[PDB]
Design a protein around this ligand. Structure first.
Ligand SMILES: Nc1ncnc2c1ncn2[C@@H]1O[C@H](COP(=O)(O)OP(=O)(O)O)[C@@H](O)[C@H]1O
Ligand SMILES: Nc1ncnc2c1ncn2[C@@H]1O[C@H](COP(=O)(O)OP(=O)(O)O)[C@@H](O)[C@H]1O
Ligand SMILES: C[C@@](O)(CCOP(=O)(O)OP(=O)(O)O)CC(=O)O
Ligand SMILES: C[C@@](O)(CCOP(=O)(O)OP(=O)(O)O)CC(=O)O
Ligand code: BEF
Ligand code: BEF
Ligand SMILES: [Mg+2]
Ligand SMILES: [Mg+2]
Ligand SMILES: [Mg+2]
Ligand SMILES: [Mg+2]
Lengths: 327, 327
């Protein structure tokens, strides 16, 4: 009496950021977002539900996770169990091919892969739409890792209408790269979930953020239609800076930046001045991600090596949607 | 046929920031501000108007200033000349006992000292109120260096009503210190005047800034009434962070921070966690200024020496108002 399943999901990086929930229970976002799924980082997860298990068990990178580290996996497992009317405890075993809790979207690949493995094991036969919707309840960003290439999370207005979808771009995404500047792969002080909740509830800058998201999304859609890389870059760099500005208006204010983050952003501006078209974005952590055309990637790498070791510069290209597996 | 005068003015540091002009021509501010005048940094300036001069001449730290570097001194000189109906060119010779254009308020001490020297030479006999009003037209922050200790610039609504005044604090200001962490004493890329104009005109965060200034000013007045150092510190640290957040929402966005700025702010938070009550503020530049009680100043210095050389840590205490001199 056991049910099992397996999934691989890749990370994605938001070009237009999700920042702040309109509904915390269902993870419905205050604004829509738009991401690129990436080939270099991903999560592989298997789940076993079994009538003979005595408790939920979560093993991550071969390490048993403690109660605090398992509380959220357990919340997700409770959701999918009530959805299927399944009364069995489960065993989640996951491997992160990505640093955990470092602002590199391990929650997106991780909860997408768990949603996909649960969907298989409990035989939910979810459409891509509905798998995105379920992943969303584990981590907002996970609903976008269901898809490859460019994807857009439409905020919708309810559990039924908030989910992601692929953005066809005439394979423009295969002409692009994202170069990761790893400043610190440690676990962040302020989780994405806690930071954005603080911003929503207290930041005096949060209305400015919201007032600009839809304009940015449109500009990105028109730049994708016209394969305008500089215009894409200018929008997403400013969107990233705008999102991080909101945390300086929170009460108390905080920042995700470290000193190396600012050094890397200044260098990206220097690369641009010396003729390398490239543009930075950041997420909830100190690492800096640089959007650049494949043409210019080794150029950028060599420029950036003047201040960063080779191990600090990880390239990534467009990646695939979720892959489900029977076991 | 010559008229001469001399003045010394000290810098001040804004606890509640002036950021953005409501009237650029007269330098009337969008919000009121509150500063502490400091003993360690100052400017000494002499002016000579003389019928035999053939042009305005500005010498700063013994270096002749070129046209671009003199354009603003000339604007001020034109103002005071039209005010007095004086048709003579002038010679301004100034010494900055403070780094110039580095976010350490050289414009406040510098234009205050020029206003004071012009007032003497042309025999304007200005009250403190009216000397603050004239200094204001040279640099907003200069209207506060007319006074010592705590001072408040009331935004008013016109040239007649926008000016500063001393804030009596039962000599609380003599129990305080400001420790300067010098990250870079070079001249800034984005002048205070250009940066705040960019923020006013384009930043989506500028309304959040304005919506919080008066609350902060009141909290500072109540903390001064009750000599509540931790409450003073919490307000001014957040006010500083809020002001700098506005530049990340500008179009294009920019920051005054450098990597060392973030390192210093994180250390100040570490000093606080290890039992040293202290609080950081920043102005339009990368240097970090730390408010601390005199009791705790050597403690802070020793803590900060773990990452900064002794030459990078300049203490300053409450300072005096402007001093006028006949020549
Ligand atoms: N493979 C995984 N399976 C389950 N939960 C995961 C996995 N990887 C990460 N997480 C969860 O995501 C949290 C980090 O989320 P977040 O703060 O959004 O960081 P990140 O920037 O890596 O997404 C981890 O602390 C953990 O709770
Ligand atoms: N002693 C002085 N006399 C006249 N003008 C001065 C003097 N010191 C500084 N300034 C003016 O102030 C400008 C710097 O202003 P600002 O950008 O506000 O920098 P800061 O943070 O030093 O005030 C200088 O470039 C110069 O035009
Ligand atoms: C800055 C961001 O990376 C924040 C991601 O937030 P999460 O999706 O990680 O948070 P939860 O929905 O609470 O799981 C921007 C983005 O990924 O869209
Ligand atoms: C961040 C600040 O230091 C900005 C000072 O701006 P300035 O008064 O130097 O600018 P102008 O009025 O154009 O001469 C905050 C403050 O001093 O109040
Ligand atoms: F990608 Be993480 F959620 F900042
Ligand atoms: F004090 Be400066 F004008 F930033
Ligand atoms: Mg993410
Ligand atoms: Mg995440
Ligand atoms: Mg100043
Ligand atoms: Mg100034």
């Amino acid at each position: 009496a056991m049910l099992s399943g397996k999934a691989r999901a890749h990370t994605n990086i938001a070009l237009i950021k999700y920042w702040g929930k309109a509904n915390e229970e269902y993870i419905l976002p205050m604004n829509s977002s738009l991401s690129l799924t990436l080939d270099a980082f991903y999560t592989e997860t298997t789940v076993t539900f079994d009538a003979h298990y005595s408790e939920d068990v979560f093993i991550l990178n071969g390490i048993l996770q403690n109660e605090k580290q398992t509380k959220k996996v357990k919340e997700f497992l409770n959701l999918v169990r009530q959805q299927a009317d399944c009364t069995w405890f489960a065993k989640v075993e996951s491997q992160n091919f990505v640093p955990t809790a470092a602002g590199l979207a391990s929650s997106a690949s991780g909860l997408a892969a768990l949603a996909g493995a649960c969907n298989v094991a409990l035989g939910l036969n979810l459409s891509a739409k509905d798998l995105s919707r379920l992943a969303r309840r584990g981590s907002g960003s996970a609903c976008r890792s269901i898809f490859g290439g460019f994807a857009q999370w439409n905020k919708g207005h309810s559990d039924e209408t908030s989910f992601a979808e692929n953005i066809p771009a005439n394979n423009w995404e295969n002409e692009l790269a994202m170069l990761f500047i790893l400043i610190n792969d440690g676990e962040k002080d302020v989780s994405s979930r806690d930071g954005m909740k603080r911003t929503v509830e207290t930041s005096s800058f949060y209305q400015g953020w919201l007032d600009n998201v839809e304009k940015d999304l449109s500009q990105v859609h028109e730049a994708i239609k016209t394969k305008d890389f500089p215009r894409l870059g200018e929008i997403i760099e400013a969107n990233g800076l705008r999102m991080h500005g909101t945390t300086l208006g929170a009460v108390p204010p905080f920042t995700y930046w470290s000193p190396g983050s600012l050094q890397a952003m200044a260098l990206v501006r220097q690369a641009r001045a010396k003729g390398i078209p490239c543009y930075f974005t950041m997420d909830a952590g100190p690492n800096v991600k640089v959007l650049v055309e494949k043409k210019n990637l080794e150029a950028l790498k060599t420029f950036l090596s003047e201040h960063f070791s080779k191990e600090q510069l990880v390239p990534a290209f467009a990646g695939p949607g979720i892959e489900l597996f029977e076991t």
